Curated annotation (Swiss-Prot):
Keywords per UniProt: Apoptosis, Cytoplasmic vesicle, Endoplasmic reticulum, Golgi apparatus, Host-virus interaction, Lipid droplet, Membrane, Phosphoprotein
GO cellular component terms attached to this protein's record: COPI-coated vesicle; COPII vesicle coat; cytosol; endoplasmic reticulum; endoplasmic reticulum membrane; Golgi apparatus; lipid droplet; perinuclear region of cytoplasm
Annotated function: Lipid transferase specifically expressed in hepatocytes, which promotes unilocular lipid droplet formation by mediating lipid droplet fusion. Lipid droplet fusion promotes their enlargement, restricting lipolysis and favoring lipid storage. Localizes on the lipid droplet surface, at focal contact sites between lipid droplets, and mediates atypical lipid droplet fusion by promoting directional net neutral lipid transfer from the smaller to larger lipid droplets. The transfer direction may be driven by the internal pressure difference between the contacting lipid droplet pair.
Record GO terms (molecular function): identical protein binding; lipid transfer activity; molecular adaptor activity; phosphatidic acid binding
Residues of the full protein shown: 1 to 116 of 219
Keyword Endoplasmic reticulum assigned: yes
Family: Belongs to the CIDE family.
Protein name as it appears in the record: Lipid transferase CIDEB
Top-level division of the source organism's lineage: Eukaryota
Organism: Homo sapiens
């Protein structure tokens, strides 16, 4: 009927059409933050605890006294590699849970557990 191929069934029937519809459905504007299970992790693996906490500004005091009590400490984030010392911390990154507290004069270390080249022979 045709020349070579016009619209055969067995050829490219493996696409993924998931263009669903969504645009805000349960957005809440309560003043106090809702209790959410946040996961906090120390620099490499010294301390790892994840509990539900609800705090706006005082929430920062937790990351500090949680491991060590200090009056002034630099808050850094290995997620992107940036240093912060004000409430802008969680506001400088997308919604996520990351916490690190150390003294100044310290850079980020190499931390990756994906598929480096450590394995290849067998």
């Amino acid at each position: 009927m045709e020349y070579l191929s016009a619209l055969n069934p067995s050829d490219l029937l493996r696409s993924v059409s998931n263009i669903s519809s969504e645009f805000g459905r349960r957005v809440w504007t309560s003043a106090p933050p809702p209790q959410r299970p946040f996961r906090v992790c120390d620099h490499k693996r010294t301390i790892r605890k994840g509990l539900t906490a609800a705090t706006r500004q005082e929430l920062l005091a937790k990351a500090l006294e949680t491991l060590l009590l200090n009056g002034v400490l630099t808050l850094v984030l290995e997620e992107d590699g940036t240093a912060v010392d004000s409430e802008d911390f969680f506001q400088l990154l997308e919604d996520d849970t990351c916490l690190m507290v150390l003294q100044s004069g310290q850079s980020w270390s190499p931390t990756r557990s994906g598929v480096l080249h450590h394995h290849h022979h067998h």
